[PDB]
Scaffold this active site. Structure first.
Site, PDB file in Angstrom:
ATOM      1  N   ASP A   1       2.054   3.111 -21.465  1.00  0.00           N
ATOM      2  CA  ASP A   1       1.315   3.965 -20.545  1.00  0.00           C
ATOM      3  C   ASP A   1       0.843   5.248 -21.215  1.00  0.00           C
ATOM      4  O   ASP A   1       1.614   6.186 -21.342  1.00  0.00           O
ATOM      5  CB  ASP A   1       2.219   4.295 -19.357  1.00  0.00           C
TER       6      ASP A   1
ATOM      7  N   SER B   1     -16.673  11.948 -21.056  1.00  0.00           N
ATOM      8  CA  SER B   1     -17.695  10.929 -21.210  1.00  0.00           C
ATOM      9  C   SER B   1     -19.068  11.577 -21.039  1.00  0.00           C
ATOM     10  O   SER B   1     -19.221  12.530 -20.270  1.00  0.00           O
ATOM     11  CB  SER B   1     -17.489   9.812 -20.196  1.00  0.00           C
TER      12      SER B   1
END
Length: 330
Positions: free
Chosen positions: A35, A199
């Site tokens: 994770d 992004s």
């Protein structure tokens, strides 16, 4: 040193991925959920409330010659999905794909919430975010990657998740045969303890790419892709019959639909998520309505590039002095 381990979906939807990890001496092999959005390595164990164990493989520290109890230490974690677990703390020898860390904090669960009990395939979590999120008290403990770093050939790990198939976690090297084209690297902020990046935009299907900054985290422990409501609305508007359902808890669509791809930007580069990756199957057994793999982050407080996005790429988690993220198509 390096390590290389295969990671395998737990079910036919890729709800999560498990990776075998050797703990203790002699080795006890547990299948852990790697994770990159948390920083605790915790396991089902001989100390876990018996009624909260249902099929998991447990770690038994008393059977390990190298286990040591961290006196007085406790841990307690709550995840974004509302699940939780807590317990005490050992250190022990932990190996992943041939890479060994001695004295790794192994957090033994005394209590786990229902969603963990109900998942027989996941024996615990191995956190790969920054150690500043580690929940051990009174003294925070380091992640497996942090402990391994100085020994690695290069201070990196890579995630290469499969679509309906096994993939690979590598430590200490970049497998240049595992991706197409080049890797584009992009800045990371560690201020919140995550692999947080920005992004450069998105496209829906064959649509023209929209240049816009989307701050989010690379999170292998989250199943779906969670993005701003504007972006998510634009995506599902291109799917006939799609709608946001408050009762189901997200966007749903007719299972017969052909889903468009979704593209996200990494600098001037682009990662394309095929439409099939966005299909998470019937909302309930036998239903002709299906659950979408791109959902709104509104209410979460952060955007999450989870498995739906990450499995479309070869992803480099560069733990150099100034960390970065790298993405390549594959």
């Amino acid at each position: 040193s390096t390590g290389s381990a295969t990671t395998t979906p737990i079910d036919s939807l890729d709800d999560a991925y498990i990776t075998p990890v050797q703990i203790g001496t002699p080795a006890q092999t547990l299948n852990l959920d790697f994770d990159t959005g948390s920083s605790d390595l915790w396991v089902f164990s001989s100390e876990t409330t018996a009624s909260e164990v249902d099929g998991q493989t447990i770690y038994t520290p008393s059977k390990s010659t190298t286990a040591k109890l961290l006196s007085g230490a406790t841990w307690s974690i709550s995840y974004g999905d509302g699940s939780s677990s807590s317990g005490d703390v050992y250190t022990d020898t932990v190996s992943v794909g041939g890479l060994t860390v001695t004295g790794q904090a192994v957090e033994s669960a005394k209590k786990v919430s229902s969603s963990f009990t109900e998942d027989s395939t996941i024996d615990g979590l191995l956190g790969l975010a920054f150690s500043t999120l580690n929940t051990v008290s009174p003294t925070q403990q380091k992640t497996f990657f942090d402990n391994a770093k100085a020994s690695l050939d290069s201070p990196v790990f890579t995630a290469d998740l499969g679509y309906h198939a096994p993939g690979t976690y590598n430590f200490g090297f970049i497998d240049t045969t595992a991706y197409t084209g080049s890797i584009t690297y992009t800045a990371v902020s560690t201020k919140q303890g995550f692999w947080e990046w920005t992004s450069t935009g998105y496209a829906v299907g064959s649509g023209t790419f929209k240049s816009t900054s989307i701050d989010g985290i690379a999170d292998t422990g989250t199943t779906l892709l969670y993005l701003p409501a504007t972006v998510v609305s634009a995506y599902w508007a291109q799917v006939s019959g799609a709608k946001s359902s408050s009762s189901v808890g997200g966007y749903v669509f007719p299972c017969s639909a052909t889903l468009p791809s979704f593209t996200f930007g990494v600098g001037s580069a682009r990662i394309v998520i095929p439409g099939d990756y966005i299909d998470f199957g019937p909302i309930s057994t036998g239903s002709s309505s299906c659950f979408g793999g791109i959902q709104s982050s509104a209410g979460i407080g952060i955007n999450i590039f989870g498995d739906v996005a990450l499995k479309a790429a070869f992803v480099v988690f560069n733990g150099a002095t100034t960390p970065t993220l790298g993405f390549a198509s594959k």
